[PDB]
Amino acid sequence: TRHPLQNRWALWYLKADRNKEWEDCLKMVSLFDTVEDFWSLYNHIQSAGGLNWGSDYYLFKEGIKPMWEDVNNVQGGRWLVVVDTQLLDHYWLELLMAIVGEQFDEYGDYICGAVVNVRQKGDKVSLWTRDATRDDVNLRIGQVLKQKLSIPDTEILRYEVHKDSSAKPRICL
Amino acid sequence: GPHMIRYNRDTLMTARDAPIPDEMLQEINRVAPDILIA
Ligand SMILES: C[n+]1cn([C@@H]2O[C@H](COP(=O)(O)OP(=O)(O)OP(=O)(O)O)[C@@H](O)[C@H]2O)c2nc(N)[nH]c(=O)c21
Ligand SMILES: [Cl-]
Ligand SMILES: [Zn+2]
């Protein structure tokens, strides 16, 4: 039984270390490109809710580093979902299933990857996209995101441009 | 050529299973031992 995915994905993990620069905390853990390997990986690593504070997971397409500075991200941005543990785990897994299952219709090429940040101030789940200048694309992606994660209409999601994060939302939903 | 390969939520959930591939175990243990549950 082998079910190939459209894309090959890499899980990255960031463990907080106050004596390292940000990029030096980031490690590429494993790549996968089948449904079977997706579940093998997910089922045998700590859930997002079980990560220590300051830790991150990133799931990005093969060849895209989960950095603003990556050529694939530099002109891009993210949809941001703020939380405030089962809800966080749910947001993360629903998002992973939506991206590896290619559930963003004709806009899959604009998906770079997903991010979960575990933080005392409030956990964050984000979807990084390729081109912050395409409001039409990003809006549709945002609508699928809210639908797949069962986010209430009253929770207003922000689309943030990476160039701004590196230095106010471009879109709100 | 063929269409995009898609899996909706129900299909992925039904496919969800078991040991992991040894190559995967090796990789996780080597770079992120603290997240491994296996
Ligand atoms: C995603 N990302 C995060 N950082 C570093 O991590 C910080 C953002 O950190 P964070 O994106 O992990 O969120 P956090 O909730 O911790 O941020 P906060 O609300 O400002 O406390 C930035 O100030 C950078 O120093 C980054 N630094 C670089 N160079 N490139 C990146 O892509 C990048
Ligand atoms: Cl879920
Ligand atoms: Zn492969």
Ligand SMILES: [Zn+2]
């Ligand atoms: Zn769920």
Ligand SMILES: [Zn+2]
């Ligand atoms: Zn077909």
Ligand SMILES: [Zn+2]
């Ligand atoms: Zn067709």
